[PDB]
Design an enzyme around this catalytic site. Structure first.
Site, PDB file in Angstrom:
ATOM      1  N   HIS A  27       0.814  -1.210   0.000  1.00  0.00           N
ATOM      2  CA  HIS A  27       0.000   0.000   0.000  1.00  0.00           C
ATOM      3  C   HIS A  27       0.856   1.272   0.000  1.00  0.00           C
ATOM      4  O   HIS A  27       0.460   2.285  -0.537  1.00  0.00           O
ATOM      5  CB  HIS A  27      -0.893   0.000   1.226  1.00  0.00           C
ATOM      6  CG  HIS A  27      -1.738  -1.220   1.335  1.00  0.00           C
ATOM      7  ND1 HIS A  27      -2.735  -1.510   0.430  1.00  0.00           N
ATOM      8  CD2 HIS A  27      -1.723  -2.234   2.222  1.00  0.00           C
ATOM      9  CE1 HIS A  27      -3.321  -2.639   0.769  1.00  0.00           C
ATOM     10  NE2 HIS A  27      -2.720  -3.101   1.850  1.00  0.00           N
TER      11      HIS A  27
ATOM     12  N   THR B 228      -6.328   4.413   6.037  1.00  0.00           N
ATOM     13  CA  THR B 228      -6.369   3.107   5.402  1.00  0.00           C
ATOM     14  C   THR B 228      -7.199   2.172   6.266  1.00  0.00           C
ATOM     15  O   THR B 228      -7.213   2.307   7.487  1.00  0.00           O
ATOM     16  CB  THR B 228      -4.968   2.501   5.216  1.00  0.00           C
ATOM     17  OG1 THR B 228      -4.234   2.607   6.445  1.00  0.00           O
ATOM     18  CG2 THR B 228      -4.222   3.223   4.104  1.00  0.00           C
TER      19      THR B 228
ATOM     20  N   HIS C 239       1.886   9.125   1.092  1.00  0.00           N
ATOM     21  CA  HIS C 239       0.887   8.908   0.063  1.00  0.00           C
ATOM     22  C   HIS C 239       1.265   9.845  -1.071  1.00  0.00           C
ATOM     23  O   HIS C 239       1.675  10.981  -0.820  1.00  0.00           O
ATOM     24  CB  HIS C 239      -0.514   9.229   0.570  1.00  0.00           C
ATOM     25  CG  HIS C 239      -0.885   8.486   1.827  1.00  0.00           C
ATOM     26  ND1 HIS C 239      -1.614   7.326   1.822  1.00  0.00           N
ATOM     27  CD2 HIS C 239      -0.574   8.733   3.122  1.00  0.00           C
ATOM     28  CE1 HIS C 239      -1.747   6.889   3.071  1.00  0.00           C
ATOM     29  NE2 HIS C 239      -1.120   7.715   3.879  1.00  0.00           N
TER      30      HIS C 239
HETATM   31  N1  EVI Z   1      -2.411   6.841   6.835  1.00  0.00           N
HETATM   32  S1  EVI Z   1      -2.446   7.091   8.436  1.00  0.00           S
HETATM   33  O1  EVI Z   1      -1.245   7.710   8.890  1.00  0.00           O
HETATM   34  O2  EVI Z   1      -3.663   7.774   8.812  1.00  0.00           O
HETATM   35  C1  EVI Z   1      -2.525   5.560   9.242  1.00  0.00           C
HETATM   36  N2  EVI Z   1      -3.319   4.529   8.957  1.00  0.00           N
HETATM   37  C2  EVI Z   1      -3.128   3.441   9.869  1.00  0.00           C
HETATM   38  C3  EVI Z   1      -2.163   3.691  10.825  1.00  0.00           C
HETATM   39  S2  EVI Z   1      -1.512   5.243  10.608  1.00  0.00           S
HETATM   40 ZN    ZN Z   2      -0.898   7.663   5.907  1.00  0.00          ZN
END
Ligand code: EVI
Ligand code: ZN
Ligand code: EVI
Length: 259
Positions: free
Chosen positions: A63, A198, A95
């Site tokens: 991912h 995610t 991302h």
């Molecule tokens: N992309 S995020 O940093 O919001 C994240 N998702 C799961 C653990 S940290």
């Molecule tokens: Zn993230």
């Protein structure tokens, strides 16, 4: 098992079928409307304490890629700002888009940046990450926008190892990396309560999104775009556009640390 991704057939519009919290009350990311966000003089300066950070490994998880840290004691921590207590750095990842005009998860007055860095931290009062993600104040994610311009010198060590983790499930040693080299000059920020972006989309995150983007070169982000979502030997699917779009703000306020 998990079969979600970013494609047409398993992307963000499908996630709710296996992760119904996707339609919840505090989902992330969101658009930050800069005119509506209110300066909150009660917020504190952030404390980013990464002097003793111990990076260990970099992993292509299918991912994104995660740079993982030793979080077995308080070595790299985030405190202050909107936070109560101490949050330990566990990993960072990005991302990004297929082209420079998209890639970020948060947007600023609907502007999409080329990419967004997430430094993920868990609240030590819950003892382990798995317990923390079950709590509304379990994680603190420091989000930093990337725009394309001059190279970010501190990012180059990351980009140069990506050839060795091209496909899902590959990892490489990644010791002695200093994440301080990924920050902008200013720690001015917006904050709001949200979620992981995610699956399983858990509503456990205090978001701290820095106002000042970092600049990275076109060449640096082009190397992100050479990674693969797929495993070794499988049909090549470039790892691009691994971002969730902005979600409804609902009953939330975005606060600014700066006037
Ligand atoms: N992309 S995020 O940093 O919001 C994240 N998702 C799961 C653990 S940290
Ligand atoms: Zn993230
Ligand atoms: N994104 S998801 O896991 O809900 C999914 N959609 C289609 C097959 S699997």
């Amino acid at each position: 098992a998990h079969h979600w991704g970013y494609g047409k057939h398993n992307g963000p519009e499908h996630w709710h079928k296996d992760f119904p919290i996707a339609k919840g009350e505090r989902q992330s990311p969101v658009d930050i409307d800069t005119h509506t966000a209110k300066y909150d003089p009660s917020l504190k300066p952030l404390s980013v304490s990464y002097d003793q950070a111990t990076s260990l490994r970099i992993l292509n998880n299918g991912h994104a890629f995660n740079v993982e840290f030793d979080d077995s004691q308080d070595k790299a921590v985030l405190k202050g700002g909107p936070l109560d207590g101490t949050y330990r750095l566990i990993q960072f990842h990005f991302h990004w888009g297929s082209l420079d005009g998209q890639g970020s998860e948060h947007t600023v007055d609907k502007k999409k940046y080329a990419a967004e860095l997430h430094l993920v931290h868990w609240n030590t009062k819950y003892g382990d990450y798995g317990k923390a993600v079950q709590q509304p104040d379990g994680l603190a994610v420091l989000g930093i926008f990337l725009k394309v311009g001059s190279a970010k010198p501190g990012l180059q060590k990351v980009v140069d190892v990506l050839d060795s983790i091209k496909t899902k499930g590959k990892s490489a040693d990644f010791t002695n990396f200093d994440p301080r080299g990924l920050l902008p000059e200013s720690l001015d920020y917006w904050t709001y309560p949200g979620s992981a972006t995610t699956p399983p989309l858990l509503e456990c995150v205090t978001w701290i999104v820095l106002k000042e983007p970092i600049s990275v070169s076109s060449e640096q982000v082009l190397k992100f775009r050479k990674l693969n979502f797929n495993g070794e030997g499988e049909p090549e699917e470039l790892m691009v556009d691994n971002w969730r779009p902005a979600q409804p703000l609902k009953n939330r306020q975005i606060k600014a640390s700066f006037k």
